[PDB]
Design an enzyme around this catalytic site. Structure first.
Site, short mmCIF file in Angstrom:
data_model
loop_
_atom_site.label_atom_id
_atom_site.label_comp_id
_atom_site.label_asym_id
_atom_site.label_seq_id
_atom_site.Cartn_x
_atom_site.Cartn_y
_atom_site.Cartn_z
N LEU A 16 8.51 20.18 31.09
CA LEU A 16 8.08 19.07 30.54
C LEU A 16 7.68 18.15 31.80
O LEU A 16 6.52 17.30 31.49
CB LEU A 16 8.85 18.85 29.74
CG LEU A 16 9.94 19.55 28.96
CD1 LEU A 16 10.91 19.10 27.96
CD2 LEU A 16 9.33 19.29 27.67
N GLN A 18 7.63 17.07 36.26
CA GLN A 18 7.99 17.08 37.59
C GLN A 18 8.47 15.55 38.42
O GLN A 18 9.16 14.86 37.20
CB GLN A 18 6.92 17.37 38.15
CG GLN A 18 6.49 18.79 37.39
CD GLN A 18 5.23 19.89 38.40
OE1 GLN A 18 4.24 20.27 37.70
NE2 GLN A 18 5.21 20.64 39.22
N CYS A 20 9.61 13.73 42.84
CA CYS A 20 10.28 13.40 43.80
C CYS A 20 12.20 13.56 43.50
O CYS A 20 12.39 13.83 44.50
CB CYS A 20 10.09 12.72 44.63
SG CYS A 20 8.01 12.83 45.53
N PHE A 21 12.48 13.65 42.40
CA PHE A 21 13.64 13.70 41.79
C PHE A 21 14.09 14.93 41.62
O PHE A 21 15.63 15.15 41.49
CB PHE A 21 14.10 12.66 40.80
CG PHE A 21 14.13 10.93 40.76
CD1 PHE A 21 15.04 10.30 41.39
CD2 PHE A 21 12.90 10.55 40.51
CE1 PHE A 21 14.80 9.31 41.67
CE2 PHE A 21 11.97 9.11 40.64
CZ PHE A 21 13.63 8.31 41.20
N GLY A 22 13.44 16.44 41.18
CA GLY A 22 13.69 17.59 40.29
C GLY A 22 12.50 17.26 39.61
O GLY A 22 11.27 17.47 39.49
N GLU A 23 13.67 18.28 38.63
CA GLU A 23 12.27 18.12 37.41
C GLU A 23 13.20 18.22 35.76
O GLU A 23 14.26 18.98 36.24
CB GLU A 23 11.27 19.49 37.02
CG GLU A 23 10.78 20.11 36.54
CD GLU A 23 9.79 21.26 37.10
OE1 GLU A 23 10.27 22.59 37.38
OE2 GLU A 23 8.54 21.65 36.83
N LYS A 38 18.21 18.70 32.94
CA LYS A 38 17.43 18.30 33.91
C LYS A 38 18.24 18.57 35.54
O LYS A 38 19.13 19.45 35.81
CB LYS A 38 18.18 16.62 34.03
CG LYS A 38 17.09 16.00 35.22
CD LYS A 38 18.13 14.28 35.22
CE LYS A 38 17.12 13.84 36.06
NZ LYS A 38 17.88 12.13 36.10
N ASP A 129 17.81 -0.28 33.66
CA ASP A 129 16.64 0.29 33.08
C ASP A 129 16.21 0.31 31.59
O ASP A 129 15.87 1.61 30.83
CB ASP A 129 16.99 1.91 33.52
CG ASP A 129 14.98 2.04 34.16
OD1 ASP A 129 14.22 1.41 33.86
OD2 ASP A 129 15.50 3.33 35.61
C1 LIG Z 1 13.10 15.28 30.94
C2 LIG Z 1 13.48 15.32 29.51
C3 LIG Z 1 14.54 14.86 28.84
C4 LIG Z 1 16.00 14.65 29.07
C5 LIG Z 1 16.58 14.41 29.91
C6 LIG Z 1 18.01 14.09 30.58
C7 LIG Z 1 18.50 12.12 30.46
C8 LIG Z 1 19.83 11.84 30.98
N1 LIG Z 1 19.58 11.09 31.05
C9 LIG Z 1 20.83 10.04 30.11
O1 LIG Z 1 20.41 10.58 29.44
C10 LIG Z 1 21.30 9.25 30.75
C11 LIG Z 1 22.37 8.84 32.18
C12 LIG Z 1 22.86 8.09 32.10
C13 LIG Z 1 23.18 7.34 31.62
C14 LIG Z 1 22.80 7.24 30.23
C15 LIG Z 1 22.87 5.66 28.54
F1 LIG Z 1 24.17 5.48 29.79
F2 LIG Z 1 22.51 5.41 28.96
F3 LIG Z 1 23.59 7.10 27.86
C16 LIG Z 1 22.18 7.88 29.69
C17 LIG Z 1 20.64 13.30 31.63
C18 LIG Z 1 20.01 14.17 31.45
C19 LIG Z 1 18.59 15.71 31.63
C20 LIG Z 1 18.74 16.84 30.85
C21 LIG Z 1 14.64 14.72 26.68
C22 LIG Z 1 15.20 15.19 26.34
N2 LIG Z 1 14.99 15.97 24.82
C23 LIG Z 1 13.29 15.80 24.98
N3 LIG Z 1 12.44 15.80 26.10
C24 LIG Z 1 12.84 15.50 27.17
N4 LIG Z 1 12.32 15.01 28.04
C25 LIG Z 1 11.33 15.35 28.82
C26 LIG Z 1 10.95 14.12 28.91
O2 LIG Z 1 9.62 13.82 28.23
C27 LIG Z 1 7.79 14.12 28.59
C28 LIG Z 1 13.57 14.33 31.44
C29 LIG Z 1 14.91 13.97 31.96
N5 LIG Z 1 16.29 13.18 32.30
C30 LIG Z 1 12.50 13.57 32.65
O3 LIG Z 1 13.00 14.23 33.63
N6 LIG Z 1 11.79 13.17 32.58
C31 LIG Z 1 10.31 12.57 33.38
#
Ligand SMILES: *C(c1c(C#Cc2cc(NC(=O)c3cccc(C(F)(F)F)c3)ccc2C)c2cncnc2n1CCOC)[C@@H](C#N)C(=O)NC
Length: 258
Positions: A16, A18, A20-23, A38, A129
């Protein structure tokens, strides 16, 4: 850790995004349930720092926050939340999916985001953020708050002195009100990060968009007062936008874009 999972439970189906933090990947956990995952690139960043993200997600549950299902503490690391069917809100608004999102739909979203942030407010936590890039959408236009990993969307005192309060989150939320009303354009058109901090501290704020009701511009201007304690709460914002078309702007009729 009782959140933990054995590695054999996760199919990482499709990729979905990529970086510098991972993917992160769309996938299937436990055969049955579909999930988002993630990863961590072991070279670029550290475990104990990247895993403080999950730490926070563990102590937060609310219907308008993305739900952490599971974790994997050893590299390659996997933080594993639910899956949201429609991707980022940013992608949704700019997307053809939201060529036809009128004010009614947009203000409901803002209400759901607000509720969720009003929860964060209640839990004495801070997002640091908030912007449409970290809001996810699912079925029925459910919206939820996320955090993946700067200055247009964050309040001056934060950008500058690092005073990141919930009131820094209210400001940004105000800026997020401009994304929902512009179909996900960028704020401060033809302005660049260093010109922004001048104009803002000088007192420049954005004008009520085309056809966006001034009631919403005032709300944004409450979001963007310089004195932070006199920005409103997510408790008030929630109730406000919940009642928007009955209490604040019942005259409302649609038009071309809103
Ligand atoms: C890729 C992505 C995801 C996802 C995800 C995901 C999010 C998080 N982070 C949080 O929700 C979070 C962290 C800290 C604090 C909070 C708070 F306080 F607000 F609640 C929330 C952690 C781990 C993961 C796996 C996702 C989910 N469903 C559908 N599509 C998703 N995508 C694609 C993004 O759209 C292109 C996302 C991430 N991470 C990413 O890397 N984007 C570039």
């Amino acid at each position: 850790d009782a959140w933990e999972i054995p590695r054999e439970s996760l199919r990482l189906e499709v990729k979905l995004g990529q970086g510098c933090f991972g993917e992160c990947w769309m996938g299937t956990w436990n055969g049955t349930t579909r999930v988002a995952i993630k990863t961590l690139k072991p070279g670029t960043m550290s475990p104990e720092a990247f895993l403080q993200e999950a730490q926070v997600m563990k102590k937060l549950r609310h219907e308008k926050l993305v739900q952490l299902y599971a974790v994997v503490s050893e590299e390659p690391i996997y933080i594993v939340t639910e899956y949201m069917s429609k991707g980022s809100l940013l992608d949704f608004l700019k997307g053809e999916m939201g060529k036809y999102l009128r004010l009614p739909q947009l203000v409901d979203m803002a209400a759901q985001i607000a509720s969720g942030m009003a929860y964060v407010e209640r839990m004495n936590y801070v997002h640091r953020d908030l912007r449409a890039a970290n809001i996810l959408v699912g079925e029925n236009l459910v919206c939820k708050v996320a955090d993946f990993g700067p200055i247009k969307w964050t309040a001056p005192e934060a950008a500058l002195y690092g005073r990141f309060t919930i009131k820094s989150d209210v400001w940004s939320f105000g800026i997020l009100l401009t994304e929902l009303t512009t179909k996900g354009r960028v704020p401060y058109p033809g302005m660049v990060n260093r010109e922004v901090l001048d104009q803002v501290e000088r007192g420049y704020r954005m004008p009520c968009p085309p056809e966006c009701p001034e009631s919403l511009h005032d709300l944004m201007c409450q979001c963007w007062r310089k004195d932070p304690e006199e920005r409103p709460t997510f408790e008030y914002l929630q109730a406000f936008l919940e009642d928007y078309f009955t209490s604040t702007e019942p005259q409302y009729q649609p038009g071309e874009n809103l």
